Amino acid sequence: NVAHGLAWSYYIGYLRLILPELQARIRTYNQAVSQRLYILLPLDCGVPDNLSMADPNIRFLDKLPQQTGDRAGIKDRVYSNSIYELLENGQRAGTCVLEYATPLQTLFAMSQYSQAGFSREDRLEQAKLFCRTLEDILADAPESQNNCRLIAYQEPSLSQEVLRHLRQ
Amino acid sequence: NVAHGLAWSYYIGYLRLILPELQARIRTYNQAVSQRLYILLPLDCGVPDNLSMADPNIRFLDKLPQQTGDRAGIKDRVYSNSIYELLENGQRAGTCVLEYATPLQTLFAMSQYSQAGFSREDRLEQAKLFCRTLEDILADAPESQNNCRLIAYQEPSLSQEVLRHLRQ
Protein backbone atom coordinates (compact mmCIF):
# COMPACT_ATOMS: atom_id res chain seq x y z
CA ASN A 1 0.00 0.00 0.00
CA VAL A 2 1.58 3.37 1.12
CA ALA A 3 4.62 1.64 2.65
CA HIS A 4 5.89 0.37 -0.74
CA GLY A 5 6.27 3.95 -1.91
CA LEU A 6 7.89 5.25 1.24
CA ALA A 7 10.44 2.41 1.19
CA TRP A 8 11.32 3.21 -2.44
CA SER A 9 11.50 6.89 -1.49
CA TYR A 10 13.78 6.10 1.44
CA TYR A 11 16.06 4.27 -1.03
CA ILE A 12 15.93 6.69 -3.97
CA GLY A 13 15.96 9.94 -1.96
CA TYR A 14 18.51 8.95 0.68
CA LEU A 15 20.10 5.51 1.01
CA ARG A 16 21.30 5.27 -2.57
CA LEU A 17 22.85 8.78 -2.27
CA ILE A 18 24.65 8.40 1.11
CA LEU A 19 25.63 4.73 1.37
CA PRO A 20 28.10 4.97 -1.53
CA GLU A 21 29.96 7.78 0.31
CA LEU A 22 29.46 6.61 3.95
CA GLN A 23 32.71 4.65 4.38
CA ALA A 24 34.60 7.66 2.98
CA ARG A 25 32.93 9.83 5.60
CA ILE A 26 33.70 7.37 8.44
CA ARG A 27 37.45 7.20 7.56
CA THR A 28 37.55 11.01 7.47
CA TYR A 29 36.13 11.04 11.01
CA ASN A 30 38.85 8.53 12.26
CA GLN A 31 41.43 11.18 11.27
CA ALA A 32 36.43 2.54 16.78
CA VAL A 33 33.31 3.41 14.70
CA SER A 34 31.54 0.55 12.86
CA GLN A 35 31.54 0.73 9.04
CA ARG A 36 27.73 0.34 8.70
CA LEU A 37 24.77 2.59 9.04
CA TYR A 38 22.39 1.07 11.58
CA ILE A 39 18.73 1.79 10.84
CA LEU A 40 16.17 1.39 13.60
CA LEU A 41 12.75 0.26 12.48
CA PRO A 42 10.35 0.20 15.40
CA LEU A 43 7.31 -1.66 14.07
CA ASP A 44 4.85 0.34 16.18
CA CYS A 45 6.15 3.53 14.42
CA GLY A 46 7.12 5.07 17.81
CA VAL A 47 9.99 7.15 16.49
CA PRO A 48 11.40 9.74 18.89
CA ASP A 49 13.49 12.67 17.65
CA ASN A 50 15.89 12.55 20.61
CA LEU A 51 17.47 9.12 20.58
CA SER A 52 19.65 9.66 23.74
CA MET A 53 16.56 10.15 25.91
CA ALA A 54 14.94 7.01 24.46
CA ASP A 55 17.53 4.82 26.25
CA PRO A 56 20.04 6.00 28.85
CA ASN A 57 22.62 3.52 27.43
CA ILE A 58 22.58 5.26 23.98
CA ARG A 59 24.55 8.48 23.93
CA PHE A 60 25.27 11.06 21.20
CA LEU A 61 28.96 11.44 20.49
CA ASP A 62 29.40 13.41 17.31
CA LYS A 63 28.29 14.12 13.75
CA LEU A 64 29.99 12.61 10.73
CA PRO A 65 31.28 15.25 8.26
CA GLN A 66 28.41 16.56 6.13
CA GLN A 67 27.61 15.40 2.62
CA THR A 68 26.15 18.18 0.44
CA GLY A 69 24.76 18.49 -3.09
CA ASP A 70 22.34 20.41 -5.28
CA ARG A 71 19.00 18.55 -5.19
CA ALA A 72 15.77 19.52 -7.01
CA GLY A 73 16.66 23.28 -7.11
CA ILE A 74 18.03 23.52 -3.56
CA LYS A 75 21.64 24.60 -3.47
CA ASP A 76 23.73 22.48 -1.03
CA ARG A 77 21.13 20.20 0.48
CA VAL A 78 22.72 18.71 3.56
CA TYR A 79 22.84 15.03 4.56
CA SER A 80 24.25 14.75 8.16
CA ASN A 81 24.49 11.63 10.30
CA SER A 82 25.05 11.18 14.02
CA ILE A 83 27.47 8.80 15.81
CA TYR A 84 26.36 7.20 19.11
CA GLU A 85 28.07 5.17 21.82
CA LEU A 86 26.26 2.21 23.26
CA LEU A 87 26.70 1.46 26.97
CA GLU A 88 26.31 -1.81 28.87
CA ASN A 89 26.75 -1.78 32.67
CA GLY A 90 28.51 1.59 32.51
CA GLN A 91 31.05 0.43 29.85
CA ARG A 92 31.47 1.81 26.35
CA ALA A 93 30.62 -1.32 24.38
CA GLY A 94 30.09 -0.05 20.83
CA THR A 95 30.13 2.94 18.62
CA CYS A 96 28.18 3.40 15.40
CA VAL A 97 26.29 5.69 13.10
CA LEU A 98 22.69 5.18 14.11
CA GLU A 99 19.24 6.47 13.20
CA TYR A 100 15.56 5.72 12.84
CA ALA A 101 13.88 5.19 9.51
CA THR A 102 12.04 8.52 9.36
CA PRO A 103 9.30 7.43 6.98
CA LEU A 104 7.83 5.45 9.90
CA GLN A 105 6.93 8.87 11.33
CA THR A 106 4.92 9.51 8.14
CA LEU A 107 3.08 6.25 8.69
CA PHE A 108 2.32 7.41 12.25
CA ALA A 109 1.16 10.91 11.23
CA MET A 110 -0.99 9.60 8.38
CA SER A 111 -2.71 7.27 10.82
CA GLN A 112 -3.67 10.36 12.94
CA TYR A 113 -4.91 12.61 10.08
CA SER A 114 -8.45 11.76 8.91
CA GLN A 115 -7.91 13.15 5.42
CA ALA A 116 -5.11 10.54 4.82
CA GLY A 117 -7.41 7.52 4.64
CA PHE A 118 -5.29 5.30 6.77
CA SER A 119 -6.55 3.75 9.97
CA ARG A 120 -4.60 3.65 13.28
CA GLU A 121 -5.06 -0.15 13.25
CA ASP A 122 -3.05 -0.40 9.95
CA ARG A 123 0.17 1.05 11.35
CA LEU A 124 1.92 -2.24 12.27
CA GLU A 125 1.03 -3.85 8.93
CA GLN A 126 2.35 -0.86 6.97
CA ALA A 127 5.55 -0.83 9.09
CA LYS A 128 6.07 -4.52 8.37
CA LEU A 129 5.44 -3.96 4.70
CA PHE A 130 7.89 -1.05 4.76
CA CYS A 131 10.53 -3.19 6.46
CA ARG A 132 9.99 -6.04 3.92
CA THR A 133 10.16 -3.74 0.91
CA LEU A 134 13.26 -2.00 2.17
CA GLU A 135 14.95 -5.43 2.88
CA ASP A 136 14.07 -6.57 -0.73
CA ILE A 137 15.48 -3.35 -2.10
CA LEU A 138 18.77 -3.46 -0.13
CA ALA A 139 19.48 -7.19 -0.77
CA ASP A 140 19.83 -6.37 -4.42
CA ALA A 141 21.11 -2.77 -4.32
CA PRO A 142 24.76 -2.20 -5.50
CA GLU A 143 25.11 0.80 -3.14
CA SER A 144 24.52 -1.69 -0.29
CA GLN A 145 27.36 -4.18 0.26
CA ASN A 146 27.86 -4.31 3.97
CA ASN A 147 27.24 -0.52 4.23
CA CYS A 148 24.13 -0.80 6.41
CA ARG A 149 21.92 -2.86 8.68
CA LEU A 150 18.17 -2.80 9.38
CA ILE A 151 17.21 -3.40 12.98
CA ALA A 152 13.49 -4.08 13.14
CA TYR A 153 11.82 -4.60 16.52
CA GLN A 154 8.56 -4.51 18.39
CA GLU A 155 8.45 -3.33 22.00
CA PRO A 156 6.11 -5.49 24.23
CA SER A 157 16.37 -3.02 25.65
CA LEU A 158 17.25 -1.01 22.52
CA SER A 159 20.98 -0.68 23.24
CA GLN A 160 21.28 -4.47 23.74
CA GLU A 161 19.35 -5.01 20.48
CA VAL A 162 21.83 -2.77 18.62
CA LEU A 163 24.76 -4.35 20.51
CA ARG A 164 23.89 -7.88 19.35
CA HIS A 165 24.24 -6.82 15.74
CA LEU A 166 27.48 -4.99 16.46
CA ARG A 167 28.67 -8.26 18.06
CA GLN A 168 30.84 -9.64 15.27
CA ASN B 1 -1.48 4.74 -5.76
CA VAL B 2 2.19 5.57 -4.77
CA ALA B 3 1.67 9.32 -5.29
CA HIS B 4 -0.83 9.60 -2.40
CA GLY B 5 1.87 8.49 0.02
CA LEU B 6 4.61 10.68 -1.39
CA ALA B 7 2.35 13.74 -1.23
CA TRP B 8 1.53 12.99 2.43
CA SER B 9 5.25 12.43 3.04
CA TYR B 10 6.11 15.73 1.37
CA TYR B 11 3.63 17.41 3.77
CA ILE B 12 4.46 15.54 6.98
CA GLY B 13 8.24 15.35 6.50
CA TYR B 14 8.82 18.84 5.12
CA LEU B 15 6.09 21.36 4.33
CA ARG B 16 4.42 21.22 7.72
CA LEU B 17 7.84 21.69 9.41
CA ILE B 18 9.20 24.60 7.31
CA LEU B 19 6.17 26.63 6.22
CA PRO B 20 5.36 27.72 9.79
CA GLU B 21 8.88 29.22 10.10
CA LEU B 22 9.41 30.41 6.48
CA GLN B 23 8.22 34.01 6.87
CA ALA B 24 10.48 34.32 9.93
CA ARG B 25 13.39 33.14 7.81
CA ILE B 26 12.55 35.55 4.94
CA ARG B 27 12.42 38.62 7.28
CA THR B 28 15.78 37.57 8.76
CA TYR B 29 17.23 37.57 5.22
CA ASN B 30 15.86 41.16 4.51
CA GLN B 31 18.05 42.33 7.42
CA ALA B 32 12.28 42.35 -2.41
CA VAL B 33 11.78 38.59 -1.78
CA SER B 34 8.22 37.18 -2.08
CA GLN B 35 6.68 35.77 1.13
CA ARG B 36 5.76 32.38 -0.44
CA LEU B 37 7.59 29.22 -1.22
CA TYR B 38 7.10 28.45 -4.91
CA ILE B 39 7.01 24.72 -5.68
CA LEU B 40 7.60 23.54 -9.23
CA LEU B 41 5.72 20.44 -10.24
CA PRO B 42 6.70 19.36 -13.73
CA LEU B 43 4.12 16.72 -14.65
CA ASP B 44 6.56 14.72 -16.77
CA CYS B 45 8.75 14.32 -13.61
CA GLY B 46 11.74 15.94 -15.41
CA VAL B 47 13.32 17.42 -12.30
CA PRO B 48 16.85 18.78 -12.72
CA ASP B 49 19.13 19.35 -9.73
CA ASN B 50 20.60 22.57 -11.14
CA LEU B 51 17.72 24.95 -11.63
CA SER B 52 19.85 27.87 -13.06
CA MET B 53 20.91 25.75 -16.05
CA ALA B 54 17.29 24.70 -16.70
CA ASP B 55 16.43 28.28 -17.80
CA PRO B 56 18.92 31.08 -18.39
CA ASN B 57 16.36 33.59 -16.96
CA ILE B 58 16.37 31.83 -13.53
CA ARG B 59 19.43 32.63 -11.46
CA PHE B 60 20.58 31.54 -7.98
CA LEU B 61 21.01 34.46 -5.62
CA ASP B 62 21.39 33.15 -2.10
CA LYS B 63 20.32 30.69 0.58
CA LEU B 64 17.82 31.56 3.28
CA PRO B 65 19.21 31.06 6.82
CA GLN B 66 19.11 27.37 7.76
CA GLN B 67 16.42 25.75 9.87
CA THR B 68 17.76 22.86 12.01
CA GLY B 69 16.31 20.29 14.39
CA ASP B 70 16.77 16.80 15.80
CA ARG B 71 14.79 14.40 13.58
CA ALA B 72 14.48 10.60 13.98
CA GLY B 73 17.88 10.27 15.80
CA ILE B 74 19.83 12.69 13.58
CA LYS B 75 21.22 15.61 15.50
CA ASP B 76 20.66 18.96 13.67
CA ARG B 77 19.02 17.84 10.45
CA VAL B 78 19.24 20.78 8.11
CA TYR B 79 16.43 22.31 6.02
CA SER B 80 17.94 24.93 3.60
CA ASN B 81 16.15 26.80 0.84
CA SER B 82 17.47 28.76 -2.13
CA ILE B 83 16.42 32.23 -3.38
CA TYR B 84 16.34 32.89 -7.14
CA GLU B 85 15.94 35.96 -9.33
CA LEU B 86 13.75 35.72 -12.37
CA LEU B 87 14.78 37.64 -15.50
CA GLU B 88 12.68 38.93 -18.39
CA ASN B 89 14.45 40.66 -21.31
CA GLY B 90 17.56 41.19 -19.19
CA GLN B 91 15.63 42.83 -16.29
CA ARG B 92 15.34 41.56 -12.73
CA ALA B 93 11.60 41.01 -12.61
CA GLY B 94 11.08 38.91 -9.48
CA THR B 95 12.76 37.29 -6.58
CA CYS B 96 11.52 34.28 -4.65
CA VAL B 97 12.32 31.12 -2.78
CA LEU B 98 11.91 28.43 -5.39
CA GLU B 99 12.28 24.66 -5.72
CA TYR B 100 11.04 21.49 -7.34
CA ALA B 101 8.90 18.96 -5.53
CA THR B 102 11.59 16.30 -5.05
CA PRO B 103 9.26 13.33 -4.70
CA LEU B 104 8.64 13.65 -8.46
CA GLN B 105 12.21 12.36 -8.82
CA THR B 106 11.14 9.26 -6.87
CA LEU B 107 8.28 8.77 -9.30
CA PHE B 108 10.82 9.02 -12.14
CA ALA B 109 13.35 6.61 -10.58
CA MET B 110 10.67 4.07 -9.66
CA SER B 111 9.50 4.09 -13.26
CA GLN B 112 13.08 3.09 -14.33
CA TYR B 113 13.66 0.32 -11.73
CA SER B 114 12.00 -3.00 -12.66
CA GLN B 115 11.74 -4.16 -9.05
CA ALA B 116 9.46 -1.13 -8.23
CA GLY B 117 6.44 -2.37 -10.19
CA PHE B 118 5.66 0.92 -11.79
CA SER B 119 5.57 1.39 -15.53
CA ARG B 120 7.16 4.32 -17.41
CA GLU B 121 3.72 5.01 -18.95
CA ASP B 122 2.25 5.69 -15.43
CA ARG B 123 4.52 8.63 -14.63
CA LEU B 124 2.21 11.46 -15.78
CA GLU B 125 -0.81 9.95 -14.01
CA GLN B 126 1.12 9.56 -10.74
CA ALA B 127 2.44 13.15 -11.05
CA LYS B 128 -1.10 14.42 -11.54
CA LEU B 129 -2.30 12.39 -8.60
CA PHE B 130 0.58 13.75 -6.52
CA CYS B 131 -0.28 17.31 -7.51
CA ARG B 132 -4.00 16.76 -6.69
CA THR B 133 -3.27 15.17 -3.31
CA LEU B 134 -0.82 17.87 -2.35
CA GLU B 135 -3.37 20.62 -3.40
CA ASP B 136 -6.08 18.88 -1.23
CA ILE B 137 -3.68 18.71 1.67
CA LEU B 138 -2.53 22.36 1.48
CA ALA B 139 -6.05 23.85 0.99
CA ASP B 140 -6.91 22.62 4.43
CA ALA B 141 -3.53 22.76 6.20
CA PRO B 142 -3.15 25.41 9.00
CA GLU B 143 0.61 25.70 8.29
CA SER B 144 -0.40 26.91 4.81
CA GLN B 145 -2.05 30.35 4.72
CA ASN B 146 -0.46 32.15 1.86
CA ASN B 147 2.96 30.60 2.71
CA CYS B 148 3.34 28.69 -0.56
CA ARG B 149 2.27 28.13 -4.15
CA LEU B 150 2.22 25.04 -6.37
CA ILE B 151 3.18 25.64 -9.97
CA ALA B 152 2.24 22.58 -12.00
CA TYR B 153 3.09 22.46 -15.70
CA GLN B 154 3.65 20.20 -18.65
CA GLU B 155 6.29 21.04 -21.25
CA PRO B 156 5.11 20.39 -24.89
CA SER B 157 9.07 29.30 -20.61
CA LEU B 158 9.56 28.38 -16.93
CA SER B 159 10.59 31.86 -15.75
CA GLN B 160 7.47 33.40 -17.37
CA GLU B 161 5.32 30.67 -15.75
CA VAL B 162 6.77 31.57 -12.32
CA LEU B 163 6.53 35.30 -13.12
CA ARG B 164 2.77 35.14 -13.82
CA HIS B 165 2.15 33.86 -10.32
CA LEU B 166 4.46 36.46 -8.82
CA ARG B 167 2.39 39.03 -10.77
CA GLN B 168 0.17 40.37 -8.00
Side-chain angles (χ1 to χ4, degrees):
Chain A
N1 196 51
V2 175
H4 177 75
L6 296 178
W8 272 99
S9 179
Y10 196 56
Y11 176 58
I12 286 152
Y14 184 60
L15 290 187
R16 94 177 171 164
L17 310 173
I18 66 155
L19 289 178
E21 250 97 51
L22 183 71
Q23 247 84 114
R25 288 163 72 217
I26 289 160
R27 291 168 213 140
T28 303
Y29 189 82
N30 312 147
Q31 222 96 316
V33 185
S34 165
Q35 305 274 305
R36 314 211 225 305
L37 172 61
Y38 292 87
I39 301 176
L40 300 176
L41 294 89
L43 296 178
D44 66 6
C45 307
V47 175
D49 294 342
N50 190 297
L51 183 40
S52 316
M53 82 191 179
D55 185 321
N57 296 321
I58 301 189
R59 174 168 85 210
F60 175 77
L61 190 67
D62 214 345
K63 298 175 195 165
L64 249 14
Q66 294 178 346
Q67 169 180 345
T68 71
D70 297 345
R71 299 273 300 106
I74 298 165
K75 178 141 172 86
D76 306 308
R77 187 160 165 188
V78 188
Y79 301 89
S80 47
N81 294 94
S82 294
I83 305 153
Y84 291 84
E85 299 201 302
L86 298 151
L87 307 182
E88 184 190 23
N89 297 295
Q91 292 299 305
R92 291 166 50 256
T95 296
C96 68
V97 15
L98 189 62
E99 66 197 53
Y100 286 100
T102 312
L104 298 170
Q105 284 187 334
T106 298
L107 292 177
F108 197 93
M110 285 185 83
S111 73
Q112 305 173 301
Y113 281 122
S114 52
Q115 216 203 327
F118 190 130
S119 75
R120 161 254 139 73
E121 296 180 353
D122 298 339
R123 221 141 65 193
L124 176 55
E125 181 192 60
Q126 290 300 306
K128 274 149 64 182
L129 217 135
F130 173 91
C131 184
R132 290 139 103 117
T133 301
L134 193 64
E135 285 166 41
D136 294 334
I137 292 164
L138 298 179
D140 206 32
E143 304 88 7
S144 167
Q145 36 180 248
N146 311 1
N147 267 321
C148 98
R149 275 247 43 179
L150 310 180
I151 294 155
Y153 63 95
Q154 210 182 315
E155 211 186 307
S157 84
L158 189 49
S159 58
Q160 289 294 295
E161 215 96 64
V162 179
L163 276 158
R164 281 193 300 150
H165 293 268
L166 291 170
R167 262 144 196 159
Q168 192 39 15
Chain B
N1 196 51
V2 175
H4 177 75
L6 296 178
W8 272 99
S9 179
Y10 196 56
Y11 176 58
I12 286 152
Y14 184 60
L15 290 187
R16 94 177 171 164
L17 310 173
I18 66 155
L19 289 178
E21 250 97 51
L22 183 71
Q23 247 84 114
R25 288 163 72 217
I26 289 160
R27 291 168 213 140
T28 303
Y29 189 82
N30 312 147
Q31 222 96 316
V33 185
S34 165
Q35 305 274 305
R36 314 211 225 305
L37 172 61
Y38 292 87
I39 301 176
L40 300 176
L41 294 89
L43 296 178
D44 66 6
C45 307
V47 175
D49 294 342
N50 190 297
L51 183 40
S52 316
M53 82 191 179
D55 185 321
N57 296 321
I58 301 189
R59 174 168 85 210
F60 175 77
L61 190 67
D62 214 345
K63 298 175 195 165
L64 249 14
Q66 294 178 346
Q67 169 180 345
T68 71
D70 297 345
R71 299 273 300 106
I74 298 165
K75 178 141 172 86
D76 306 308
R77 187 160 165 188
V78 188
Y79 301 89
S80 47
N81 294 94
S82 294
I83 305 153
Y84 291 84
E85 299 201 302
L86 298 151
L87 307 182
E88 184 190 23
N89 297 295
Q91 292 299 305
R92 291 166 50 256
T95 296
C96 68
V97 15
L98 189 62
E99 66 197 53
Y100 286 100
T102 312
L104 298 170
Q105 284 187 334
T106 298
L107 292 177
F108 197 93
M110 285 185 83
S111 73
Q112 305 173 301
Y113 281 122
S114 52
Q115 216 203 327
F118 190 130
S119 75
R120 161 254 139 73
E121 296 180 353
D122 298 339
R123 221 141 65 193
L124 176 55
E125 181 192 60
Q126 290 300 306
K128 274 149 64 182
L129 217 135
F130 173 91
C131 184
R132 290 139 103 117
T133 301
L134 193 64
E135 285 166 41
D136 294 334
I137 292 164
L138 298 179
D140 206 32
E143 304 88 7
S144 167
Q145 36 180 248
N146 311 1
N147 267 321
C148 98
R149 275 247 43 179
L150 310 180
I151 294 155
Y153 63 95
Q154 210 182 315
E155 211 186 307
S157 84
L158 189 49
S159 58
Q160 289 294 295
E161 215 96 64
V162 179
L163 276 158
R164 281 193 300 150
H165 293 268
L166 291 170
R167 262 144 196 159
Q168 192 39 15

